Design a protein around this ligand. Structure first.
Ligand SMILES: COc1cc(-c2cncc(-c3ccc(C4CCN(C)CC4)cc3)c2C)cc(OC)c1OC
Ligand SMILES: COc1cc(-c2cncc(-c3ccc(C4CCN(C)CC4)cc3)c2C)cc(OC)c1OC
Ligand SMILES: COc1cc(-c2cncc(-c3ccc(C4CCN(C)CC4)cc3)c2C)cc(OC)c1OC
Ligand SMILES: COc1cc(-c2cncc(-c3ccc(C4CCN(C)CC4)cc3)c2C)cc(OC)c1OC
Lengths: 291, 282
């Protein structure tokens, strides 16, 4: 059985559309790519051909299809379906206790460290980490989605595959070295460091929604207060590179041991010097020790 | 909205290192399903990337339907195309002789497919070199035209089958930074295909047996070294039988295949010049 039924659109954008569908009675997500984003479809297909990629905190792959008759091409990616939707969605309708906040950020760190670390599976940098690319599971863990911009590297064979996708990361989550275009494009470690920056921004988005002493912040995206709505590449460069802005730590976090620890972590994701930033493994280890 | 992805696999029509090819059906409609071996997965990725770049549509190119990747307990890679029940030119030449019209129709259809691969169109398509042209990678259609198959090694602007390698590939002098070099390698291979087909064309009651190129000078599964010695060191070329020189079509085809086999790659005819020559024969 390969028959798939499309039930409802759960997402529409420049990237294409995502549909909740049914396959052998089980929900599946079906991403239909815009022809503009054919290189992401191909790159995502290459990444999911890695057999050790499979991980509880990585969106689980089912199939990839390129179909064509005459001059018309369809590009499908079929994955497991997460009915609670993205972290970005989830954070806007719920506050978190300490246990939920740490389960979410530890699971994202565990997924990110699984991507970053070579197994003797190539080491993989994501390059578009953001709360819309993180899905919430019913067990309270998250999984990382969208490997369309991913870079691969094996130290074992001295291979670096940066792909040929002209797509760039989400402007709001771009590291300073990405915004000022100084990033070392033939250095694998540069791409892991951009992920750590983005992860710091996701930590901040999540921590704002953890209640302490009866106080919580509203859901906001990174840099909500310092850039125009729908910020341009230049808008983000101004705040991150010229103004040296970082997300503000609400003073109320400093009364809570958990939020104090998370504030320290996210600040170690945000050094302008990329080599100063924590590794995904160090972040995983710190979050394992926090309670 | 239902998406019927169910492909029945009905009979296996090919097996080998590459994996297997099956006659399949999708909604009553015959399809060909190439199921790749782990060994040959790079050929699935190269052909998928090519078709994700340019959706080739040509009567003399095997018709693309789908590239499918499925997760199992490992990854299955399927390429789905149009089905040609008459099979490969290699298989077809074994149990059939040709007359002048069918011979020219076969080789002009192959030239047309190859010129279409090779030509850059702006607007369009990149220039494409095949890199494994041979009679096994050509399929015969019921209208008596062929289509070129297997873009697994194709390059846009594994190694080729050793028996069909051009001198510059065997002696490792191919100018790898000039895209025209890959075109010239295809033309050499096209020359050998031409020779395989022309042997099966009847004239004055005579035909040659089906033989693969260099059948008389190298073993079955010839080594790289076996091929280099024949093609590069001794500079041998396939035999033109005397009986061809009594027939104006075979005389013109002998001249054509000779102009595909120059040791100097830049002296070889282009696919477009071969097409023109073939339109002036008979
Ligand atoms: C992969 O291959 C095959 C696919 C199909 C098939 C099945 N449903 C729908 C379609 C379709 C409908 C409409 C559009 C376009 C129309 C123009 N508009 C501007 C945008 C949308 C594209 C595609 C197709 C092509 C049938 C086939 O054969 C009978 C195929 O071959 C096996
Ligand atoms: C990011 O990337 C990919 C994501 C998914 C995916 C998987 N499960 C569930 C979803 C989902 C379901 C429902 C909602 C709701 C929540 C908000 N509400 C206002 C309407 C929408 C959102 C999200 C998605 C989007 C699939 C993908 O590919 C098949 C993705 O591409 C890699
Ligand atoms: C995912 O996988 C496979 C799918 C199919 C397949 C089956 N029915 C219908 C389709 C179809 C085509 C095109 C559209 C259009 C509709 C109009 N809209 C504006 C743009 C999109 C919709 C649907 C396909 C692509 C066949 C396959 O095999 C031959 C597949 O591979 C196993
Ligand atoms: C070269 O390459 C590819 C070829 C094909 C392909 C397409 N149509 C038909 C065929 C075929 C069918 C049947 C016979 C024989 C078997 C029984 N009888 C004694 C005579 C007939 C031979 C050949 C094939 C093999 C598909 C591919 O991929 C999907 C290929 O890969 C690019």
């Amino acid at each position: 059985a390969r028959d798939i039924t499309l039930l409802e659109c759960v997402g529409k954008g420049r990237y294409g559309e995502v549909w909740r569908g049914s396959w052998q009675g089980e929900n599946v997500a079906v991403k239909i790519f815009s022809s503009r984003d054919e290189k992401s479809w191909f790159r995502e297909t290459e990444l999911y051909n890695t057999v050790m990629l499979r991980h509880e905190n990585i969106l689980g792959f089912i199939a990839s299809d390129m179909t064509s008759r005459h001059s018309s091409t369809q590009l499908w990616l079929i994955t497991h379906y997460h009915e609670m939707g993205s972290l970005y969605d989830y954070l806007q309708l719920t506050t978190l206790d300490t246990v939920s906040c740490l389960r979410i950020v530890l699971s994202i760190a565990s997924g990110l460290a699984h991507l970053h670390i070579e197994i003797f599976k190539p080491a993989i940098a994501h390059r578009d980490l953001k709360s819309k690319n993180i899905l919430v599971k019913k067990n309270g863990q998250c999984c990382i989605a969208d490997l369309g911009l991913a870079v691969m590297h094996s130290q074992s064979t001295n291979q670096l595959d940066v792909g040929n996708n002209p797509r760039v990361g989400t402007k709001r989550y771009m590291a300073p070295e990405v915004l000022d275009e100084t990033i070392q494009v033939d250095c694998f470690d540069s791409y892991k460091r951009v992920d750590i920056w983005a992860f710091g921004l996701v930590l901040w988005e999540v921590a704002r929604r953890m209640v302490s002493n009866g106080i919580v912040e509203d859901y906001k995206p990174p840099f909500y207060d310092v850039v125009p709505n729908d910020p341009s590449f230049e808008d983000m460069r101004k705040v991150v590179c010229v103004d040296q802005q970082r997300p503000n730590i609400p003073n109320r976090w400093f009364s809570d041991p958990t939020l104090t620890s998370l504030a320290k972590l996210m600040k170690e994701c945000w050094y302008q010097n990329p080599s100063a930033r924590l590794t995904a493994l160090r972040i995983k280890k710190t979050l394992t020790k926090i309670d």
